[PDB]
């Protein structure tokens, strides 16, 4: 079992703490969702290979430009998150997060991940976004951004329903092995 490091990046409230929690927790948090995530070492078997995947979050570090890069040393895979109910979080991907990740983590594969895909057909989400001349991020807008920033791939998930979560982490393990 080789050791690989994963770091999740993206704007505040893009669902990155929730995503790490739902993957690391054996049972869905039905009573309390923790505010923060410390770290976790996942035992993952992908395509016949056993890997110890260390999971790290950057939540809380978004306003601290000199503290935040301390999370990057020896990263093997970056999960770059945006929220599907937030087109503004997708716009910050190529100008803010991508230049930072390519500077501190050169040659590290980036997986662009569209979080909260359940909100794409939520009525409160659609009504609130319409009050700002907006709509939920379409699948092709996510793929075009992933293509444009040179991402390894594009993936979507829902931490609320657990759909697509296991697939994101198994694909991140495969990317870390290349």
């Amino acid at each position: 079992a080789i050791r690989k490091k994963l770091v999740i990046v993206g704007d505040g409230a893009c669902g990155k703490t929730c995503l790490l929690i739902v993957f690391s927790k054996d049972q869905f948090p039905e009573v309390y969702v923790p505010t923060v995530f410390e770290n976790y070492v996942a035992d993952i078997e992908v395509d016949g290979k056993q890997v110890e995947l260390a999971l790290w979050d950057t939540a809380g570090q978004e306003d601290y430009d000199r503290l935040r890069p301390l999370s990057y040393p020896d990263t093997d895979v970056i999960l770059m998150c945006f929220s599907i109910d937030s087109p503004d979080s997708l716009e910050n991907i190529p100008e803010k997060w991508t230049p930072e990740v390519k500077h501190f983590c050169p040659n590290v594969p980036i997986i662009l991940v569209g979080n909260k895909k359940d909100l794409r057909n939520d009525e409160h989400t659609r009504r609130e976004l319409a009050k700002m001349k907006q709509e939920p991020v379409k699948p092709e807008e996510g793929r075009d951004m992933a293509n444009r920033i040179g991402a390894f791939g594009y993936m979507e998930c829902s931490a609320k329903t657990k759909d697509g979560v296991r697939e994101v982490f198994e694909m991140a393990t495969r990317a870390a092995l290349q």
């Binding site: 309390y32 923060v36 410390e38 976790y40 070492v41 809380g60 000199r66 503290l67």
Partner: protein, 244 residues
């Protein structure tokens, strides 16, 4: 950690830690506030435990079993004694506030109504200046500590042998040397998230809402100062690289 505090913080939430007949006597808003307060104490208990693994398991184990210089060990675990003192003191105050709040006849049923005062004391005056200087120093020596660890593991057989031995227990799975260093660096940025969520459920008593709003401002001022004070050291860096 000590068994007493580990059992008191074994449950996934405050709602699960207290007796269900005690939980039923409280409003949902109180339960929500208490769950985030419980998470702040539980993560402070885990943080202090991470620093004891660094000082007692790694640092002292290297000094007592290896033939490395004392300056090598200092480069691997910078400010760990000062950090341990600051956080063990803070944890002691949090645990005493909980113990004082227990119901007579109970070791688990409690409600913490006042916390903002304790958070203002920790993040103001001399204790805040000491956290600021210590975290500015720690975070500036972070990269050097990781590079020094990697150099020793790949070159020294006995150092590699020591690491494999002390990190073999399952309880140490997420607590290797590099993991402990990043765990400590990330701790300070968790405080505004925890305090903001506690403040969200603390509007009932106005003195408490104001004490938590003051405490949030103090933590953010501290983080901004630690961020400004960082200048990442490099092993064998030349004066020319520094002044350019």
């Amino acid at each position: 950690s000590m068994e007493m505090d580990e059992k008191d913080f074994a449950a996934d939430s405050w709602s699960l830690a207290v007796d269900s007949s005690f939980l039923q006597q409280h409003k949902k808003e109180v339960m929500k506030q208490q769950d985030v307060i419980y998470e702040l104490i539980q993560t402070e208990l885990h943080h202090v435990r991470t620093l004891k693994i660094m000082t007692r398991l790694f640092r002292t184990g290297m000094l007592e079993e290896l033939h490395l210089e004392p300056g090598v060990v200092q480069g691997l675990f910078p400010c760990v004694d000062e950090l341990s003192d600051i956080h063990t003191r803070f944890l002691s105050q949090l645990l005493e506030r909980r113990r004082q709040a227990l119901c007579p006849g109970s070791t688990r049923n409690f409600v913490i109504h006042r916390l903002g005062d304790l958070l203002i004391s920790q993040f103001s005056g001399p204790s805040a200046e000491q956290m600021c200087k210590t975290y500015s120093e720690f975070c500036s020596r972070h990269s050097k500590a990781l590079k020094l660890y990697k150099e020793l593991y790949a070159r020294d057989k006995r150092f590699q042998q020591f690491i494999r031995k002390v990190t073999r227990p399952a309880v140490l799975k997420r607590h290797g040397v590099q993991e402990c260093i990043l765990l400590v660096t990330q701790r300070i940025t968790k405080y505004p998230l925890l305090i903001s969520r506690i403040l969200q459920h603390s509007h009932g008593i106005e003195e408490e809402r104001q004490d938590l709003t003051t405490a949030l401002g103090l933590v953010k001022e501290l983080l901004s100062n630690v961020d400004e004070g960082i200048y990442q050291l490099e092993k064998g860096a030349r004066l020319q690289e520094i002044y350019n």
